[PDB]
């Protein structure tokens, strides 16, 4: 009779019932459908996986084993669609990209 | 209860002169109980239960606190080792704001390690000490050691050296230890070099060094005899001697120890 959660029923590692709880007492609609928390759980799981993949090779490009928000900031702003998504957000301890305009160099 | 009592009285006599002493004798005759009797008689003299510092290697630190607790349990012992939270607890307890002599306080004797002294120089630069005792001073042989530098920078003004053999002969070590004894007179090493060689080196340290030996008591200790065994290499221990030079230290040392290494 005992069965496991909906997350591994959908094959997901993010909590489906917790997403359903936050949807129901988040006061967005009075009736919440069944397939909506599974869809939202899959979307947020994929976005987290893509973000951690980008932070992963950004941290391998610095020869380290830990993730600093320098790596997160770099992995955000060298990718164009995350640039478009996260344009107006500022990350804690991020800094800026190394850039210099063409005529400002010692051209000679 | 031995002839270390007159030796500690001679140490107190040169203390009354106002200079730091040198123990230049081998371990085995009981310099630990001699030093705790130095502290006990000095406390009997001018009524000081207060700040006393013991700098000691970590393996014999437990031996030191064990013999202190067994022999003279009148004082209150403090260790300085472990994690950072225990370090902060002992920093809460060893608080010695009241200067000079104190009675009802647990900082009577302070035991610690060499590394721990080296790595808490920011906290040990304060808490101006009265009597540091550094046992086994061979690690302050070098004058380039940063531990030697932070041992220089304290505000204790007593630099009694305890070691078994101070005679490691690198010709800078003697100047380094003498510069630790008086900081003030010994600072130029070139004048120490420039100012018959075997005879004139004996009476320089004569008013400071005391001359004792192990062959003065009754010898049931064993009178140790050195039996030396010299043996020959095996063939597997032979051919790597040619192999190592065929491609061309501690390397051949360990091949001598055992081939598998």
């Amino acid at each position: 009779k005992a069965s496991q959660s909906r997350s591994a029923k959908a094959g997901l590692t993010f909590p489906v019932g917790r997403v359903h709880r936050l949807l129901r007492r988040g006061n967005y609609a009075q009736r919440i459908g069944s397939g909506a928390p599974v869809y939202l759980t899959a979307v947020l799981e994929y976005l987290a996986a893509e973000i951690l993949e980008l932070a992963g090779n950004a941290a391998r490009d610095n020869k380290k084993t830990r993730i600093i928000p320098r790596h997160l900031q770099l992995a955000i702003r060298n990718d164009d669609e995350l640039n478009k998504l996260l344009g107006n957000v500022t990350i804690a301890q991020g800094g800026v990209l190394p850039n210099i305009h063409q005529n400002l160099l010692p051209k000679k | 209860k031995e002839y270390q009592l007159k030796g500690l009285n001679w140490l107190a006599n040169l203390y009354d002169q106002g200079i730091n002493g040198i123990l230049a004798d081998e371990m085995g005759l009981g310099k630990t109980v001699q030093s705790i009797s130095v502290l006990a008689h000095l406390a009997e003299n001018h009524n000081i239960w207060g700040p006393f510092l013991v700098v000691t290697p970590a393996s014999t630190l437990h031996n030191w606190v064990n013999e202190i607790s067994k022999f003279l349990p009148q004082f209150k012992i403090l260790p300085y080792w472990g994690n950072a939270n225990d370090r902060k607890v002992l920093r809460k307890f060893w608080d010695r704001k009241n200067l000079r002599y104190n009675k009802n306080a647990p900082f009577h004797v302070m035991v610690t390690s060499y590394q721990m002294v080296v790595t808490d120089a920011n906290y040990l630069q304060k808490m101006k000490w009265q009597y540091m005792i550094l046992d086994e001073a061979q690690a302050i042989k070098s004058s380039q050691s940063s531990r030697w530098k932070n041992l220089l920078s304290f505000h204790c003004r007593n630099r009694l050296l305890l070691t078994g053999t101070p005679i490691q002969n690198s010709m800078q070590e003697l100047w380094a230890l003498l510069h630790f004894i008086m900081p003030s007179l010994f600072d130029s090493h070139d004048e120490f070099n420039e100012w018959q060689q075997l005879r004139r080196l004996h009476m320089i340290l004569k008013p400071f060094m005391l001359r004792r030996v192990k062959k003065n008591v009754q010898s049931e200790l064993g009178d140790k005899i050195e039996i030396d065994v010299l043996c020959d290499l095996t063939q597997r221990q032979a051919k790597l001697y040619q192999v190592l030079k065929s491609q061309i230290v501690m390397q051949f040392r360990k091949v001598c120890n055992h081939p598998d290494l």
Partner: protein, 136 residues
Amino acid sequence: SMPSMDRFITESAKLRKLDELLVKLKSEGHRVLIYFQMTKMMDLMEEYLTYRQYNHIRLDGSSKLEDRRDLVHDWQTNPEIFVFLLSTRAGGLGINLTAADTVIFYDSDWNPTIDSQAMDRAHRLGQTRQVTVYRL
């Protein structure tokens, strides 16, 4: 065919002579300290001691500080312990080895002052019998 244990002993002549003198040292029923210079030297001796199933303990630089208390306590209380694997400067600085007399210096030739501290560790007051310092 596995690496033979006796072939591991007999291919090293220092270990060969050590195995010869341990036979009479255990036949007399004595107390033995053995010194080494490296970790890998004491990473090989206990395999030889498992052949003899001797009571042996090891103290080195990577040992935790509390274990050095109860190991010395078990040395000065239990008499059935036989082999004392010691580092150069660990057990040779002020450690009470008063009931021991036979020290085995495997490679104690790095500096004479460390060796002087080493044989000041066992040759101490309270020793009831003669001290024989072996040097292979």
